[PDB]
Amino acid sequence: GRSRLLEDFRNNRYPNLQLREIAGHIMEFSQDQHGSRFIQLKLERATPAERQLVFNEILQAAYQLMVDVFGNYVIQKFFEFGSLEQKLALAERIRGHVLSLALQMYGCRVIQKALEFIPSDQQNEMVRELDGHVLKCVKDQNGNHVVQKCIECVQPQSLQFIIDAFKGQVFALSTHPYGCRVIQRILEHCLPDQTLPILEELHQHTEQLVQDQYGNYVIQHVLEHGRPEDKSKIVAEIRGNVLVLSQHKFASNVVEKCVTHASRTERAVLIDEVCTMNDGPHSALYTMMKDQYANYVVQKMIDVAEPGQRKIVMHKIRPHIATLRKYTYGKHILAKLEKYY
RNA sequence: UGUACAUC
Numbered sequence: 109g110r111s112r113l114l115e116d117f118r119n120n121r122y123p124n125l126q127l128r129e130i131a132g133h134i135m136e137f138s139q140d141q142h143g144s145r146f147i148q149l150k151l152e153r154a155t156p157a158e159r160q161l162v163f164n165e166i167l168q169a170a171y172q173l174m175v176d177v178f179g180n181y182v183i184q185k186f187f188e189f190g191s192l193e194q195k196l197a198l199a200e201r202i203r204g205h206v207l208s209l210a211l212q213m214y215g216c217r218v219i220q221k222a223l224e225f226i227p228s229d230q231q232n233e234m235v236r237e238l239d240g241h242v243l244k245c246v247k248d249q250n251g252n253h254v255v256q257k258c259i260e261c262v263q264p265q266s267l268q269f270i271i272d273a274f275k276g277q278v279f280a281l282s283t284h285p286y287g288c289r290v291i292q293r294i295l296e297h298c299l300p301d302q303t304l305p306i307l308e309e310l311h312q313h314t315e316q317l318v319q320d321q322y323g324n325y326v327i328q329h330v331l332e333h334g335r336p337e338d339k340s341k342i343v344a345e346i347r348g349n350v351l352v353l354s355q356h357k358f359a360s361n362v363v364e365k366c367v368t369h370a371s372r373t374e375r376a377v378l379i380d381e382v383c384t385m386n387d388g389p390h391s392a393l394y395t396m397m398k399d400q401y402a403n404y405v406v407q408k409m410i411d412v413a414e415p416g417q418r419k420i421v422m423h424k425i426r427p428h429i430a431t432l433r434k435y436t437y438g439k440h441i442l443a444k445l446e447k448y449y
Numbered sequence: 450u451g452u453a454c455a456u457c
Contacts, residue, residue, distance in 0.1 A: 181457060285454080289454060321455065
């Protein structure tokens, strides 16, 4: 199975083995854990002629290496450090196989690497091969990373078909383990005509989204990178619900982002909501202080409050300072207070 | 004291 050269090599019989000495054996070495390492190492600093010798033996069977547990690394190295002609020739070997590779445990890494290094004409051609398979890829553990890379690297106008597929399914996808990732990449890189519809569906489903295991990240994302009009719509959904959501494992993260990224006015309103509102005998703020998640929202409020408003919070907290010590999460508020005394 | 994101 293994050639004498490869076996003898794994048996450490060639401490000084050079690329040029494995002529004829590139494919075999590329598919071998140690040989693949040997080649990768040797490549970054090989001479163009050495690099070309290695290339000559992998071009024809390049696909075989792209879906290989060790070979995929040798392909990638050519995309990173090979010549322009070598990258173009590798792209040609991918033609017709993008879907198959994008779903592939190792091939998907080659697709991702290629997207980063090839000219836009080739990028665009790779993308078109996913035409009619958007959701299949977005929902695949290998493929979603490829769709993400496309969005990061490819001209946004060529990605219109991905948008088309998302239209009407933004809620479903935003609560998906992989789809929430792709939605965020879209918000970052896509055109206004493309992000708009997507933002519309996110706004329609904010209540549900802030409480979702994966959806909360998409709403947080808009709060940190979104336009003010989009942040405010989200903030308006949190208003009147500060107490309840900040007690929630997932949504409490979103109320922190609202506190942090809201306008001056919106921030003052959210903090006042829980200084004013009473949860039974005492303030909403006091219930929050004792909560496993809500105690985090309080601290964030102390962090970002205007000095004047911070004084009001500290005053709301002060009367409970000795009782806070009796509560697992209460204790944590005291730690915060030291900083401010 | 608290939630996601993949190869030698």
